[model samples]
Target: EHLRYPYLECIKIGMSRDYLENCVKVSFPTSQDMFYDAYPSTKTRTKEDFSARLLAGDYDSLQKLYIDFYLAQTTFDWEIPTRDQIETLVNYANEGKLSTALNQEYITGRFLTKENGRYDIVNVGGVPDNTPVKLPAIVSKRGLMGTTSVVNAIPNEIYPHIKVYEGTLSRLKPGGAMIAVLEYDVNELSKHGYTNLWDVQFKVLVGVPHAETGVIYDPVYEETVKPYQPLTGKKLYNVSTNDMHNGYKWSNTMFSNSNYKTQILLTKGDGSGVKLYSKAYSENFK
Candidate 1:
């Protein structure tokens, strides 16, 4: 909408809060003509009149024009469409006001094409219209405990059971307070292993979150994403807070056969605490 056609596609995962809050913004056009605008006669139209009618703002003409823009220009920035966007589009397709071709092309059931230079829709991906694709299922040691938001259980093979969270970073910038409301619950980790832990450390890769391109550079855990490396390199910050524990205190250890679940707070260095900012922004959709 903001010079970013179908900008909805440019969203990033692990950062859903920013995607759902502000919905799409746009202004549909209008016209002053009543009669011809309502029932325009292309039969009575000439070539120049066709272009003129488009520019002069005839209601139905504009409707069809924007419809063309919506279908032709729309694109996704991520791998999948958000729940409602596709669901609502399918709802419109069911209404049957559009061509079967457009309805099929725009809907999510079949195949999708990625438009490139000529901007022709290139086949990307689709499904057989089978069972619904469910949201990610994060299984733990107890097996299928729940999502990271409110699931308590022991770790399975995916031990350490680490989940990444990027939320309002509450840092104290010179200009003002950096929003610092990220959260984490240790109880969600593998309690199966118990011992006096010498220390626990948190390392963060921080950088600008607003980029409109596809090239990214995230090492450590992932390859440089399909050419969408960040223009700004994320600075690494490590906080070592294991000094307070002697690696033997009961308070310093957790029991995990990967069983049970719990959510707690992060009271780390500097005494400034935080929680797992909680709730995947996706909870807003479907």
Candidate 2:
């Protein structure tokens, strides 16, 4: 039970023989108790008391004690695409029937309000309401993939694919790593027949992930995050050694969004890489 939260927090993706060593450094909690200490009853709680209870070996107890508080603060949101969804997407990619896969609904389903366990938009591009209209048989290709780690942080070396995003870890740091995913505009891409593949663009969710699983740490607010630290002498894999690939571009400006803005930009390439730093992206993409 003690290991559970850290396990979730230290979750990593990609290849590194010594990645687990990095996980050890971050498995322990940091000093930011603001979120955990925000409860009304906990308003008067001392840091000593919080630390005592945390040290008592039951973090879940604290969580249970403040479940309602957390829930009230929580916003259950987004649709994490399932295995079948990825399968359907790959099918579309294989058949060269990319139009449907590139539909706005398929890509933007994450932003659409969900109902009855699915998207409730009555019409594609229509202003979404709480209406129970089924949003076609389309599956959302978009989903929050993972948090970025320091490994292979340079976008140029891994463009057309990123190897640094995590699977379960969640946090955001400016001047640090971020979440990378793909977003496409049909109207814009069709202008070049979707074949002009040179200027490939990617949508970067700067500081956010699926809000349902949103757990953020901002150093600007004095919130500290423990990021993956690659081991010094371990084997590391790159595009030349792996069989997975994703489309992303290079730029220090890529991480420039204000932690509140998600942006997209065009660059070049479609080169296959070894695999991502984590398996989450490949697991979901495959």
Candidate 3:
């Protein structure tokens, strides 16, 4: 559908869903034709006639028709395919013709060979002809607790335990926000030599939500809340309010372990007055 293709393109350009939908409707009113042509009814021949029929529309359908055509062309960047060449390639592939494949392979090889000019190989770092390079140990950690322990400990009061998933702590660039579940080890504090402090300072890299991209945005540091007491064991601690800083004005402070599990919320900046945004929580921590 015209909507599908342009919707994705619009996202790449940072357009809103409503704006993209409007653009599609305005520019390609005849998107129905394209939709049908690309995904036609019972007739196979209609697919073959699509190109010609699209090019031969009257004035009424001309705007929509041409817009669809232009979109299709631009989508593929106007790569032309000769009927004879396509048919030959198809026949060769179907017949499992080695000669034809070898010929095509040679052509491809030549194209790639010229893509980058040849250059002499030189040894920038002096090394013997046969030398094995040594590599450091590959240690990977996951979740918030594991991540925090690997890196320099932030104010432990804010984050009793932290985990880093998928990427490294350093990768958490400033102004970029990431999804993470925090577990407040109420009992582990004394066991691990950590003080039982009610007010904790938590900080994480902040940026736009995962949904937004493009239009270079600056990163920010989001601070955590205080008086957060983690319930016993791995109880649910919903921090969805932590996602948005507007409500608590305590954009920095967020609730920790609770009897029920909750979503973690985050926002950029520090405010003193705002309502506490809350969500449900689960006990599972993995």
Candidate 4:
């Protein structure tokens, strides 16, 4: 005698089949809507016979099918303002000064705002700050200041044996928030046999989450659950009823299976799964 499969296992297999069928139905709505349109009337075979043949894996006969329909969809076009205009607006709001700084030279512009504040710079491109043209973003008022300043700048020239630094300062509306951007470049040191000495470093200080008392709370729990049954006032029910009443609600609140937003800080580095480097003057170089 064949061993009987557990009822739960049978239900799981049915659920899996339904899920696959639903996915196929959703992907091919036109096919599901007009199943008869798939095959033309032929004297050699009936519609039911053709479907049975296809279901039995008659690959050659199933290849002869076609449908003609068209669906219309709409698209949108958007235009972003120029970068300089965005930078000007940021300067006006923070330090009340508008200017572009470069290692080779500097350009002066009127203050976009009358307020003074601190701001940080964000490098749009991964290039070193010493590069002649680097896109920098000015952060002020607890938000990004200018759109234009966040764009990458074209580098037309390079400075030999020179380092460059570009940055800005801005303040928030209430005056307590301050930010600053300081770009550093050591490209000039290349003349002294230091070809690649450019690096970035910063010291950050922020308040930690702590209570006045020297006490910490620790909590731990094991995965636990109890089988539940639904009551309908003297009437008994099966697993299906329990699932319909509780399982559906619990499953709906379970962890999401959708994609989420994530930020990639650095895309390039010297390590496995990345760019590797070898020492030039060391015996261990490989």
lDDT top scorer: 2
* Candidate 4 C-alpha error for residue 109, in Å: 19
lDDT of 3 by residue, 73-94 (tens): 1242211112122223223324
TM-score of each: 0.18, 0.17, 0.19, 0.14
Query: Sorted by lDDT, highest first, which candidate order results?
Result: 2, 3, 1, 4
| Model 1: residues with Cα > 4 Å off, grouped in runs | 1-83, 91-101, 108-234, 237-286
Choose 3 or 4, whichever is better by TM-score: 3
What is candidate 2's lDDT per residue for 109-204, written digit by digit as tens?
212122222221112222234323221222222332222321111121111222333355422233333433333334434443343434332222
For the record, the alpha-carbon RMSD of candidate 3 to the native fold, in angstroms, is: 24.1
**Model 3 segments more than 4 A misplaced:** 1-181, 207-219, 227-286
lDDT of each: 0.24, 0.28, 0.27, 0.23
TM accuracy, model 4: 0.14
Per-residue accuracy of model 1 over 1-286 as CA lDDT, tens digit each: 3574333321321113333221132111111121123224554433344346544435245334432233222221222222223333344334542223333443443221111211111111333334232211101112111122111111111123233333443232222211222222334422322121222223221221112211111212111101111112221222221213324221121122122111212222322212111111111110
Question: Least accurate stretch of 10 residues (summed lDDT) in model 1?
Answer: 222-231
Instruction: Sort all candidates by TM-score, best to worst.
Output: 3, 1, 2, 4
Mind giving the per-residue lDDT tens digits that candidate 4 earns over 201-286?
Answer: 11111211112211111101111122122211121111111223334332221112121111101001221111111111111110
Which scores better on TM-score, 2 or 4?
Answer: 2
- Tell me the spans in candidate 2 whose CA falls farther than 4 Å from its real position: 1-37, 42-46, 72-145, 148-286
State in Å the error of residue 265, model 1: 17
Off by over 4 Å in 4: 1-116, 132-254, 261-286
Clash count list over all predictions? 32, 8, 34, 13
